[PDB]
Coordinates of C-alpha atoms and ligand atoms in Angstrom, one line a residue:
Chain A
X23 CA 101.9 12.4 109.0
X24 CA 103.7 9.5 108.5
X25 CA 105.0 6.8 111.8
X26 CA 108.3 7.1 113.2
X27 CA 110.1 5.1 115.9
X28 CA 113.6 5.7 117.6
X29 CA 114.9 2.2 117.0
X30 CA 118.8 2.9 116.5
X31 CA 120.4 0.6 113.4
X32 CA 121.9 -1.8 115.8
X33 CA 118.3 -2.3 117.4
X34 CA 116.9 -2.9 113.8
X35 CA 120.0 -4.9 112.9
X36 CA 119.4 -7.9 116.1
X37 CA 115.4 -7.7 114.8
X38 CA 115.9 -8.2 111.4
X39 CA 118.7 -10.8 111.4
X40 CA 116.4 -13.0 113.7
X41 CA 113.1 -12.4 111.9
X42 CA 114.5 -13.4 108.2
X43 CA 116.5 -16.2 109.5
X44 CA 113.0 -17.5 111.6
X45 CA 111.3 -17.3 108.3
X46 CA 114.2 -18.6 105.7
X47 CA 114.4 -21.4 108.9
X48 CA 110.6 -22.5 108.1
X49 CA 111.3 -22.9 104.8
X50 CA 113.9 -25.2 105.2
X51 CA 111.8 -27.3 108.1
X52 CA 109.2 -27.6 105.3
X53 CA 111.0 -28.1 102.2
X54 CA 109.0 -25.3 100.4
X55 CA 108.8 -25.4 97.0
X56 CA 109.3 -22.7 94.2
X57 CA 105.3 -23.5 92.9
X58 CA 105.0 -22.3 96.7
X59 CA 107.3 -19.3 96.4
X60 CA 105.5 -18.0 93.2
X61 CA 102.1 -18.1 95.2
X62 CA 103.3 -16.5 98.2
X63 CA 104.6 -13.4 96.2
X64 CA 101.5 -13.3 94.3
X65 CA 99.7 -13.5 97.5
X66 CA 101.8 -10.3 99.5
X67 CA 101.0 -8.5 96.2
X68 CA 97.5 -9.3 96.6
X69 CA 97.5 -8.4 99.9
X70 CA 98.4 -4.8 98.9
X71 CA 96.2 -4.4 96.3
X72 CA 93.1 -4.9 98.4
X73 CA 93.9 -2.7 101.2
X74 CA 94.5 -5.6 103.5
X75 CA 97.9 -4.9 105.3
X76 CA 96.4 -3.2 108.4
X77 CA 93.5 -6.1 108.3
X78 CA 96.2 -9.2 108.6
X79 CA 98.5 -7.7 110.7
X80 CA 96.1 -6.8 113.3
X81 CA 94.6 -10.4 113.0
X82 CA 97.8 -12.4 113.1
X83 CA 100.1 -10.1 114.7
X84 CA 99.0 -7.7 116.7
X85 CA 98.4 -9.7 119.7
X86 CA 102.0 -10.1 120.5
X87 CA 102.4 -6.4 120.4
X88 CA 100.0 -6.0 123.1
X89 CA 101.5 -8.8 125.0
X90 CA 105.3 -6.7 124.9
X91 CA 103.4 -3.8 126.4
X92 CA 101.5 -5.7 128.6
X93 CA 104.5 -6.4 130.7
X94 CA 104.7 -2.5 131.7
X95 CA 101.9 -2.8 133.1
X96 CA 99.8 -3.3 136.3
X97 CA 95.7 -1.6 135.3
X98 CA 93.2 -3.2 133.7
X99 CA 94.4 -5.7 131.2
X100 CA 94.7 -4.4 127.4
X101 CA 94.2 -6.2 123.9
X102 CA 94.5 -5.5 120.2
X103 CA 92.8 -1.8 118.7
X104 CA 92.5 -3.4 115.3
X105 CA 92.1 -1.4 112.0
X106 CA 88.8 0.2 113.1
X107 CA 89.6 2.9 115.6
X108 CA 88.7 6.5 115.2
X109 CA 90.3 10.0 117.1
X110 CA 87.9 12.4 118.2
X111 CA 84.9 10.6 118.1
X112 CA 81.7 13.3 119.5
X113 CA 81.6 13.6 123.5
X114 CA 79.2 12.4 125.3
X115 CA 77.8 13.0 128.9
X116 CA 78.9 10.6 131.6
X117 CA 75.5 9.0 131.6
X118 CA 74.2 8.8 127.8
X119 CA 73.4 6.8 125.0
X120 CA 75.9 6.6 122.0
X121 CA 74.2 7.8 118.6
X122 CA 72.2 4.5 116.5
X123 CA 69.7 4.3 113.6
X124 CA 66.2 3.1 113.9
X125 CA 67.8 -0.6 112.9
X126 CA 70.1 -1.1 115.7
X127 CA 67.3 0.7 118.1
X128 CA 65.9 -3.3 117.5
X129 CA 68.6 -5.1 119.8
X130 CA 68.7 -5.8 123.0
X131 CA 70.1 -2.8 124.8
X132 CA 73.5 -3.2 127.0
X133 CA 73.9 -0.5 129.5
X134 CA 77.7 -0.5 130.7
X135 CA 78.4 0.8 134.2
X136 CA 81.8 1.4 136.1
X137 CA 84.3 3.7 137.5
X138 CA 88.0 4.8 136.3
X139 CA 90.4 4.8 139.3
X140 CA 94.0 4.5 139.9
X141 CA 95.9 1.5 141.1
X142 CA 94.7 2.2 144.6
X143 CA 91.4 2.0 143.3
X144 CA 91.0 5.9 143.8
X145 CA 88.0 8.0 141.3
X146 CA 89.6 9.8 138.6
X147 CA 88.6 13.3 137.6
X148 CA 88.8 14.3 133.8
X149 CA 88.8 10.9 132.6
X150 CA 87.3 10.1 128.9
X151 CA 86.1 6.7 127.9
X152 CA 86.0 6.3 123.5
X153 CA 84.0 3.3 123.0
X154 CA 83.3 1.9 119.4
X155 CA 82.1 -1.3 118.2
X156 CA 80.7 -3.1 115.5
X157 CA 76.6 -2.9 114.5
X158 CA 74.6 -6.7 114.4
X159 CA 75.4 -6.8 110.6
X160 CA 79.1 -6.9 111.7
X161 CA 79.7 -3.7 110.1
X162 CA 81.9 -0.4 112.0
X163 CA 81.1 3.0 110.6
X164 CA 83.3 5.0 108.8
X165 CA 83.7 1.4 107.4
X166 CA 80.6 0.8 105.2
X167 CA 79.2 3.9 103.5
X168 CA 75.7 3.5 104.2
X169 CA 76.2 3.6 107.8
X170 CA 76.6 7.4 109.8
X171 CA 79.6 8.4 110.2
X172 CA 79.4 8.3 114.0
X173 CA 77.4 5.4 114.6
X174 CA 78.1 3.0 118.0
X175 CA 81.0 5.4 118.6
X176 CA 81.7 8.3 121.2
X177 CA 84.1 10.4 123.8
X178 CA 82.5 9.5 127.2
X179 CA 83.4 12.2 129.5
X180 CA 83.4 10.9 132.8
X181 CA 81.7 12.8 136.4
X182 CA 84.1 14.2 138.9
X183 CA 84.3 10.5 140.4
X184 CA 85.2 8.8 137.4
X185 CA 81.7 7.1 136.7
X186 CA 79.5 6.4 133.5
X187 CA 76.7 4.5 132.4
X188 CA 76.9 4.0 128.7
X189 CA 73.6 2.4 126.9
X190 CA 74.8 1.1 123.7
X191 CA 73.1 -2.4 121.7
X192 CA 74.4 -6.1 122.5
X193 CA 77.6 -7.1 120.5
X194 CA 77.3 -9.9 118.6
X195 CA 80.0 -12.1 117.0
X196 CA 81.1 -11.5 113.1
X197 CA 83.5 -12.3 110.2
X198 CA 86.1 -10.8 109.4
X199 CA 86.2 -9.2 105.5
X200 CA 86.4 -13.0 103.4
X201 CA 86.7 -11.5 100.1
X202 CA 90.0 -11.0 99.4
X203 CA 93.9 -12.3 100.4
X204 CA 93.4 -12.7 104.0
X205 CA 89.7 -15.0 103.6
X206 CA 91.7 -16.7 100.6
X207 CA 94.8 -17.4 103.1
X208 CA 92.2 -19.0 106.0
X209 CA 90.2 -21.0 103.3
X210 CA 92.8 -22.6 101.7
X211 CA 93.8 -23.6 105.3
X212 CA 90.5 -25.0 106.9
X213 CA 90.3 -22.0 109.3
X214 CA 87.2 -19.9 110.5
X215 CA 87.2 -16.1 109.9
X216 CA 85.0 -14.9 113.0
X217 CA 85.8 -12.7 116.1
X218 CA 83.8 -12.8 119.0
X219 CA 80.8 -10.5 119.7
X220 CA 83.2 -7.5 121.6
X221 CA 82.9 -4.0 122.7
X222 CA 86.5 -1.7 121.7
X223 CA 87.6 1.1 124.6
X224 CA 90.0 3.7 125.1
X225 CA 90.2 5.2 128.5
X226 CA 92.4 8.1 129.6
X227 CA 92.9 10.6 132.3
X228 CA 95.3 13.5 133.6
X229 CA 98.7 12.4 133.9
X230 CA 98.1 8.8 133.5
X231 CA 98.8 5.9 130.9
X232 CA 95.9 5.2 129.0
X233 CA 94.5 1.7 127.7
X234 CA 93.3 0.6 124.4
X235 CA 91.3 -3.2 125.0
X236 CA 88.6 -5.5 124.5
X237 CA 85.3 -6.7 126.7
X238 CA 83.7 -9.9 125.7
X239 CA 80.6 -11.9 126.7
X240 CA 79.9 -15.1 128.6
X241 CA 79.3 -18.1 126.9
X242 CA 79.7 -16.4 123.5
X243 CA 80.4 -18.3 120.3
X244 CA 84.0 -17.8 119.1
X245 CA 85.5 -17.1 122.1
X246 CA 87.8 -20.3 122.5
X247 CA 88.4 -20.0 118.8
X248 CA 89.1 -16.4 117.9
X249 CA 90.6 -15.7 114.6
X250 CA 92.8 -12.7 115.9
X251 CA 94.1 -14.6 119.4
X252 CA 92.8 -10.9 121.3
X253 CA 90.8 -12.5 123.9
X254 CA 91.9 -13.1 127.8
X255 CA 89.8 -14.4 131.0
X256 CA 90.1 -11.4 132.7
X257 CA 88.5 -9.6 129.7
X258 CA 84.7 -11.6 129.8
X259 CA 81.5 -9.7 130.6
X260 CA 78.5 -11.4 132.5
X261 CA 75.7 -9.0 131.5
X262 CA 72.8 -10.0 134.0
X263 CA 69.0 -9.6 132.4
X264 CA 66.6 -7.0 133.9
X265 CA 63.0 -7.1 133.5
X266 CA 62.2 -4.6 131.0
X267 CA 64.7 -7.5 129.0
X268 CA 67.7 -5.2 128.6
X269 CA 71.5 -6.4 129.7
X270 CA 73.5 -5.0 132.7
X271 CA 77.0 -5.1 133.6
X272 CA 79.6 -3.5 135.9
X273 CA 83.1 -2.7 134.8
X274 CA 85.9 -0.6 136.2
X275 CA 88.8 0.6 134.7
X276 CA 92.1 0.9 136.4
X277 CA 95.0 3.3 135.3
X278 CA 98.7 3.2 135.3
X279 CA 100.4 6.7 135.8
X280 CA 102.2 7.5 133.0
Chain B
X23 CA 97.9 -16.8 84.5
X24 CA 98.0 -16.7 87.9
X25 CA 100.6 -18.9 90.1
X26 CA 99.3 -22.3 91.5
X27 CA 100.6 -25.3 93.9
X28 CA 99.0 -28.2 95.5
X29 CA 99.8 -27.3 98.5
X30 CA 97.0 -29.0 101.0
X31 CA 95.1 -27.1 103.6
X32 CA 96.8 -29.3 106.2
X33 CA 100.4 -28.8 105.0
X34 CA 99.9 -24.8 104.5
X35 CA 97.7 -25.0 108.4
X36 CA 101.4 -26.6 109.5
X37 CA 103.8 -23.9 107.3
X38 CA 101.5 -21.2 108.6
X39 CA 101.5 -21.8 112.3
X40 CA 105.1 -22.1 112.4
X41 CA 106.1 -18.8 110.2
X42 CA 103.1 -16.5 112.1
X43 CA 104.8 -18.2 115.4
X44 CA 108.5 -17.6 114.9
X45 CA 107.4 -13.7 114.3
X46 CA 105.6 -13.6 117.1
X47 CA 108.5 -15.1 119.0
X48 CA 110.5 -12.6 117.6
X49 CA 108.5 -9.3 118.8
X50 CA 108.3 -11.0 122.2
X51 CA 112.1 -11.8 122.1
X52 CA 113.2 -8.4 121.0
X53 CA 110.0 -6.4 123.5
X54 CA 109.0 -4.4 119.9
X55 CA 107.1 -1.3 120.9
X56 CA 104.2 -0.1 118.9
X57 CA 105.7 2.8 117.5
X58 CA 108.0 -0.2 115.9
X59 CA 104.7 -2.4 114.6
X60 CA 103.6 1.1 113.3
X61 CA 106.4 1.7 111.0
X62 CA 106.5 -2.0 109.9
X63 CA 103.0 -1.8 108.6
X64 CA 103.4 1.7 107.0
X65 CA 106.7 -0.1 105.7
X66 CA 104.8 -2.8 104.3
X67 CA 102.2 -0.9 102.4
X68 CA 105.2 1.3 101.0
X69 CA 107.0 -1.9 99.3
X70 CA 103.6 -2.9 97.9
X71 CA 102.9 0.5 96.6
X72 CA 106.4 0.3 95.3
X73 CA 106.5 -2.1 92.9
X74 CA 109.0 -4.0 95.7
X75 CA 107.6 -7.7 96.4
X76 CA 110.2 -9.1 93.4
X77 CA 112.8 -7.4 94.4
X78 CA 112.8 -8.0 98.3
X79 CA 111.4 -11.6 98.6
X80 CA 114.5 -12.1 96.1
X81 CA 116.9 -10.3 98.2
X82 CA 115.9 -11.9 101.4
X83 CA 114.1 -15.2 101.0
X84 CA 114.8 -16.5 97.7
X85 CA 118.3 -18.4 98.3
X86 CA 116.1 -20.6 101.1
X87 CA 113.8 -22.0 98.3
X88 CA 116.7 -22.5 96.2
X89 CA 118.3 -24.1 99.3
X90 CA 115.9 -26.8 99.3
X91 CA 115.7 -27.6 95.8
X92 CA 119.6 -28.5 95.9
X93 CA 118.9 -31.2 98.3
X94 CA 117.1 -33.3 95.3
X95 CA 119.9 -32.5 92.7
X96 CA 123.1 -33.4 91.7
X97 CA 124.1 -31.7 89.0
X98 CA 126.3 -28.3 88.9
X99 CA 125.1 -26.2 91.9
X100 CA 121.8 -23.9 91.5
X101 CA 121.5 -20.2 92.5
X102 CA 118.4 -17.8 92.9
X103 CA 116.5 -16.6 89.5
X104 CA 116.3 -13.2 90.6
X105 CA 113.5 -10.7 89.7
X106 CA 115.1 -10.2 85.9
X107 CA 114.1 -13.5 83.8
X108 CA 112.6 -13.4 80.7
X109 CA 111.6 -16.2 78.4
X110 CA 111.6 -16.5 75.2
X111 CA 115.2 -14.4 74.5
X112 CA 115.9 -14.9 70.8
X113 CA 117.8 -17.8 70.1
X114 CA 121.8 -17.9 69.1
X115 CA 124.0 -20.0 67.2
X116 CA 126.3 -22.2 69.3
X117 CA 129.4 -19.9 68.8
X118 CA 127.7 -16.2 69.3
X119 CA 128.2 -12.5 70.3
X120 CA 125.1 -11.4 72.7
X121 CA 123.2 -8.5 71.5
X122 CA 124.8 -5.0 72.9
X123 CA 125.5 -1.3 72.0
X124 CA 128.7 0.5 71.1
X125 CA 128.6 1.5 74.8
X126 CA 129.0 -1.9 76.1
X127 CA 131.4 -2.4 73.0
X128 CA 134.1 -0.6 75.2
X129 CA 134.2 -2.8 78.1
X130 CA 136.5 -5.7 78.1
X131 CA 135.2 -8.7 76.7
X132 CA 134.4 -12.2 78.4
X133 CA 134.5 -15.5 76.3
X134 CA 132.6 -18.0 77.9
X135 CA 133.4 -22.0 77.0
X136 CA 132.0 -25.7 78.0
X137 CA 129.8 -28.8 77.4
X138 CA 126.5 -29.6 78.7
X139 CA 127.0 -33.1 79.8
X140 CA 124.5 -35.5 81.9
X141 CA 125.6 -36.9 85.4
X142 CA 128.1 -39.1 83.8
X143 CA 129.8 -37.0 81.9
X144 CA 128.3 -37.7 78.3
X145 CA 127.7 -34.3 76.4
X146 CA 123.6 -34.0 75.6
X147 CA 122.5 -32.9 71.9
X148 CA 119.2 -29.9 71.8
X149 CA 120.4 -28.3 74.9
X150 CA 120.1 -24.7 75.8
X151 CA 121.9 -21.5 77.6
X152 CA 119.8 -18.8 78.5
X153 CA 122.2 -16.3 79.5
X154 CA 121.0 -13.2 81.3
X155 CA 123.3 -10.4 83.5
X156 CA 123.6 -6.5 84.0
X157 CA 125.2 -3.8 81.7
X158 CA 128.6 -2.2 83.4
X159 CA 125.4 1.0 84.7
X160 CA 123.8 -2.2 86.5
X161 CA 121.1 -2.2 84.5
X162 CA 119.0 -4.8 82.9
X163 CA 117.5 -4.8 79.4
X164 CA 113.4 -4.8 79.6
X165 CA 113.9 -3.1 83.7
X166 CA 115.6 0.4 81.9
X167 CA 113.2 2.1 78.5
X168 CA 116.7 3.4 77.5
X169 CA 117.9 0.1 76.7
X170 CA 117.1 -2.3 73.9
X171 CA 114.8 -4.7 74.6
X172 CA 117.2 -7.6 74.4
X173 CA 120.8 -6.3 75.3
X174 CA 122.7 -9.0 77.0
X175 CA 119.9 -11.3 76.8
X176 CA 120.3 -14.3 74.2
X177 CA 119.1 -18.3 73.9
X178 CA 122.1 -20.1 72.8
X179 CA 121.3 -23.3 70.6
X180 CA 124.6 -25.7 72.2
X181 CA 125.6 -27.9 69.0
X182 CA 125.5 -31.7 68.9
X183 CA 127.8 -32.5 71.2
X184 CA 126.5 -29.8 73.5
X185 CA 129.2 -27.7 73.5
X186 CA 128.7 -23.4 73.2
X187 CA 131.4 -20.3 72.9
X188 CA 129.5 -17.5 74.1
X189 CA 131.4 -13.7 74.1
X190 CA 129.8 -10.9 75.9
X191 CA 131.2 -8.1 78.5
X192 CA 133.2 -8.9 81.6
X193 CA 130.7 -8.2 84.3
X194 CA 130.2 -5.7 87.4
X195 CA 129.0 -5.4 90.6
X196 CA 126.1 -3.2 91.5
X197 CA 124.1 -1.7 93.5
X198 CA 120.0 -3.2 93.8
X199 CA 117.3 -0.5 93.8
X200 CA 118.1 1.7 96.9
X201 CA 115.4 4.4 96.5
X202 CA 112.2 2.7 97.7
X203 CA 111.4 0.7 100.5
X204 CA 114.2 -1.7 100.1
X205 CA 117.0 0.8 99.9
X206 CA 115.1 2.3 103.6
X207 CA 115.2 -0.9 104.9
X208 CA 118.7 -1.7 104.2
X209 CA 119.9 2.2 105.3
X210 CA 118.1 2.0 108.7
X211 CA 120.3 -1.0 109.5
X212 CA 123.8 0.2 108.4
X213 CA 123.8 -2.4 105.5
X214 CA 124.8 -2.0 101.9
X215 CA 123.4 -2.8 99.2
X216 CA 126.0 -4.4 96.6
X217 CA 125.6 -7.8 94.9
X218 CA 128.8 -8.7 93.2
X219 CA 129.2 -9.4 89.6
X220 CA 127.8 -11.8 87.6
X221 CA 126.3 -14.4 84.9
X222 CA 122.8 -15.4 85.8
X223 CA 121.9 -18.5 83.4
X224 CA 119.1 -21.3 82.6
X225 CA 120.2 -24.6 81.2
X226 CA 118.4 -27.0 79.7
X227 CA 117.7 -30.8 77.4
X228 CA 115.3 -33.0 76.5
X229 CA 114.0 -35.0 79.0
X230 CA 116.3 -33.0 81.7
X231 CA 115.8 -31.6 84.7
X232 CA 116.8 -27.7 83.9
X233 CA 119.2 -25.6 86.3
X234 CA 118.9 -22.1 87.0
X235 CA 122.0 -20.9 88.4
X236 CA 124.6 -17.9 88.6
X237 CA 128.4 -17.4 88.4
X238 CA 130.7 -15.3 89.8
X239 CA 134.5 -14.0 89.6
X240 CA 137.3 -15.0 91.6
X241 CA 138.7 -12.2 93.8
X242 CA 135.6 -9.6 92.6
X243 CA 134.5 -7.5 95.5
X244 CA 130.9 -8.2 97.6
X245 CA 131.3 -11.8 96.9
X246 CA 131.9 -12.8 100.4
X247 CA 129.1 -9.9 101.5
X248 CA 125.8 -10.1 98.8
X249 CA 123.2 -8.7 99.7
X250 CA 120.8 -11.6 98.4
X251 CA 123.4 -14.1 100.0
X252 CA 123.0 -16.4 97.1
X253 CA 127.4 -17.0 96.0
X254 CA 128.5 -20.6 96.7
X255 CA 132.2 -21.3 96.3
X256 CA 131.5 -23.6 93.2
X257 CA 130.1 -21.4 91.5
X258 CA 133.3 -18.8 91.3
X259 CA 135.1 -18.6 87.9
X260 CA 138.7 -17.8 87.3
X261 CA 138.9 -16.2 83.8
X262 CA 142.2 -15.8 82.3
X263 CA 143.2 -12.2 80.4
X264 CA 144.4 -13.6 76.8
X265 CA 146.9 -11.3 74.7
X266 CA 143.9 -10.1 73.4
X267 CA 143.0 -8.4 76.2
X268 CA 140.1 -10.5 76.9
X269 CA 138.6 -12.5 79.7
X270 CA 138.8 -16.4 78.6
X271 CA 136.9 -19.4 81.0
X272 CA 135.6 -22.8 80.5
X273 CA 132.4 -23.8 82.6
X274 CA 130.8 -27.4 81.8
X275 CA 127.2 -27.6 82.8
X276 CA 126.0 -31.3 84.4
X277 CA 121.9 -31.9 84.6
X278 CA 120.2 -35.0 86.2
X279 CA 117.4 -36.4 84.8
X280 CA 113.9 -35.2 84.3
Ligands
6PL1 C1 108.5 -11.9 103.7 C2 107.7 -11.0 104.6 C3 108.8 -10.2 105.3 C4 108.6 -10.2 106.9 C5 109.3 -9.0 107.5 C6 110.7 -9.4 107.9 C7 111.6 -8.1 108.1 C8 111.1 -7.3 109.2 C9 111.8 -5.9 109.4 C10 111.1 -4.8 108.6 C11 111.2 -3.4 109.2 C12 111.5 -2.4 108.2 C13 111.3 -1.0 108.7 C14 112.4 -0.1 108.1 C15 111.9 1.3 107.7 C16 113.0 2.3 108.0 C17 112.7 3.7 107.4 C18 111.5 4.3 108.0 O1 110.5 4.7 107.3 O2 111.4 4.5 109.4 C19 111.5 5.9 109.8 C20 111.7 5.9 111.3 O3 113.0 5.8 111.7 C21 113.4 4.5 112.1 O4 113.1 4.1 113.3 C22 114.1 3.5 111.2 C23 113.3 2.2 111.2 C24 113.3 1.5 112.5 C25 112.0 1.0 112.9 C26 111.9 -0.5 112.7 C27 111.2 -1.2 113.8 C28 110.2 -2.2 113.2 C29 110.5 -3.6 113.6 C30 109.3 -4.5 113.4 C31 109.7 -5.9 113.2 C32 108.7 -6.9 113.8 C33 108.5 -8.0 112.8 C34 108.7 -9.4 113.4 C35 110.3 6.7 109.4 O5 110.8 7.7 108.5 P1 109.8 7.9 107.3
6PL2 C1 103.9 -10.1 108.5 C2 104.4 -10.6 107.1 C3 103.7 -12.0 107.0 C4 104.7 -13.1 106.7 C5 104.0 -14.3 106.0 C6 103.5 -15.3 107.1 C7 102.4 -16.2 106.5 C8 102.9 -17.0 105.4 C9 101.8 -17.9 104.7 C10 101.2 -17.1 103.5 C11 100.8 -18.0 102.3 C12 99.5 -17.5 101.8 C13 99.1 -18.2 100.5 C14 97.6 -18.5 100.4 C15 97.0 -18.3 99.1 C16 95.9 -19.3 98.8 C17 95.0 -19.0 97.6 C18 95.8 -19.0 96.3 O1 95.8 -18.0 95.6 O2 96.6 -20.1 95.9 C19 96.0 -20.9 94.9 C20 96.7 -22.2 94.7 O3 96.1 -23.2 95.5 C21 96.8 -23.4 96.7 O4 97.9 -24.1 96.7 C22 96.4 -22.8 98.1 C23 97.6 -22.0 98.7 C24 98.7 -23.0 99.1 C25 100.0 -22.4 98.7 C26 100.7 -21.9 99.9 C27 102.2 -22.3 99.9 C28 103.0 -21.0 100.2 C29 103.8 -21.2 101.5 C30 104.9 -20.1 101.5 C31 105.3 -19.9 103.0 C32 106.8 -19.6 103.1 C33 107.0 -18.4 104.0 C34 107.9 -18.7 105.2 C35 96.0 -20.1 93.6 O5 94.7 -19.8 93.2 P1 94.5 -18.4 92.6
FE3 FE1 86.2 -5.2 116.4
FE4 FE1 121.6 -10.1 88.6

């Protein structure tokens, strides 16, 4: 139930030594005071209190993470999961809609189209694609109580190529949650809390090395300037219109073996 | 109630950038894995649900703040509060016993001498000693219920030449809390977790700048190995055993100006 890691004391040793003496190092660069030193433990505390460890971490330092692991690897590129993600989210047939109220039933529709291969670009048999995403109040279910437990998320199972169409509403940018030590922290700096309008994906298959990332959208607001440094090039959508107004896009996913 | 600085949003923009950066720099230095990132953020809640921000920002990051501090001063060297101040100890004639039990009766006693002076010298009328340290357990008063709320704790009134003769217990080293997040931290490492013994303190006159500072005993074990890294070779005392039996050292105190 609870993480575990095979990091041997000598492993943990090298790490700490260098992250304390990084921080005790800016300190010294910026003649920080004691006045400081009282609000920053005041402000770790409050961090804890208000549930906010997995929300700043995943902001301001997850994206390195996924930059180690990114090395590894050759598929499609990945980014952060953030604090939002759900296991075993309801399947869904390759070619479906994931499950909405009435409300989000109002925005313009985005239907999402691709393949899974391998490196060589080969179709992938029993491969699943777990989308979720945030609604265009900038709220996630499981998240905000008066939402559905299951709503914008599901297990796409893939055809015996690979393939999906997923209809699902058009992302749009929000803030992060401002009311607490994290908002306090960026408005005592002059910073913006907002991410990018995204989609979030897991995608999976036999005997291969799956890929948690992000897809993002042309032209969006916030993109340049996202609060939680997640977004790359290679990761932007260009969603072309159709004529009965909804959005289209083509995306493939490509698979490392594990 | 709550801890305040003026701290502006363009100095804490600069401090920030560089502490979130020198982590990041770390995890891309060392290739941390994501098992690793989640055990740091389950370890993180953990020292919040703990009780622990006192204890390990005192531990690890404290003795940088006091670092910086000493640059301005030049009076008798400062050391790191610690998580076990508390103000308003009851006050003591100049020549005075701290309060203890018969228990702490039985350990050999230390009789601590000196002047507060200024920086030339001159001893300084109203001046304080706030004397604070551990029992021979390691335990403070007011941070164990089986304790009296003031044992080793006192405010000693200096008289008018601002001279004091304070006798209390010969101190020991101990061990910091080791069953909580810190105590995990430190074991995964191979560390230990020993500070050696001694006096912490809080000197003050009117219209002085006060010291807060800690002293320590020539030849003790951990000294060259604290946890909290916070000894400094002038601040090592060299008590000598009377025929008595007991511990006997002078120690002038020297603040600047307010
Ligand atoms: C002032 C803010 C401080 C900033 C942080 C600086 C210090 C960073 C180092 C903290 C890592 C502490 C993790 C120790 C927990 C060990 C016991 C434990 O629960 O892990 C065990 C798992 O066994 C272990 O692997 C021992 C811990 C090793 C894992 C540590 C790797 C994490 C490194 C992350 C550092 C990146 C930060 C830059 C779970 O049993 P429950
Ligand atoms: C992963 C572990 C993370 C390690 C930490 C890295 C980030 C370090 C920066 C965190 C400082 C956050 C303090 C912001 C609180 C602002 C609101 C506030 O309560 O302060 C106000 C006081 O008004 C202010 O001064 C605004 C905050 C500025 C003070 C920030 C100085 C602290 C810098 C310490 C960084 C040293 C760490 C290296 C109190 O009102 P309540
Ligand atoms: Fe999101
Ligand atoms: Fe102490």
């Amino acid at each position: 139930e609870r993480a575990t890691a095979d990091t041997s004391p000598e492993r943990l040793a090298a790490i700490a030594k260098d992250a304390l003496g990084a921080l005790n190092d800016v300190i010294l660069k910026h003649g920080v005071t004691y006045p400081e030193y009282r609000v920053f433990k005041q402000w770790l505390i409050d961090v804890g209190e208000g549930g906010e460890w997995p929300l700043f971490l995943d902001v301001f330092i997850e994206h390195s993470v996924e930059e180690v692991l990114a090395r590894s690897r050759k598929g499609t590129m990945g980014s952060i999961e953030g604090p939002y993600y759900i296991e075993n989210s309801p399947e869904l047939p390759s070619k479906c809609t994931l499950p909405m109220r009435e409300e989000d039933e109002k925005i313009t529709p985005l239907v999402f189209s691709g393949q899974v291969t391998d490196l060589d670009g080969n179709g992938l048999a029993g491969a699943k694609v777990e989308l979720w995403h945030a609604d265009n109040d900038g709220y996630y279910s499981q998240f905000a109580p008066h939402l559905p437990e299951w709503n914008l998320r599901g297990t796409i199972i893939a055809d015996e190529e690979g393939r999906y169409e997923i209809t699902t509403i058009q992302p749009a940018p929000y803030q992060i949650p401002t009311d607490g030590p994290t908002g306090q922290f960026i408005e005592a700096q002059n910073g913006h809390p907002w991410r990018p309008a995204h989609l979030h994906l897991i995608v999976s298959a036999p005997g291969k090395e799956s890929v948690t990332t992000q897809l993002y959208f042309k032209g969006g607001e916030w993109i340049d300037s996202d609060v939680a440094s997640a977004t790359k090039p290679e990761l932007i959508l260009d969603p072309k219109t159709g004529d009965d107004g909804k959005n289209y896009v083509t995306y493939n996913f490509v698979l490392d073996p594990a």
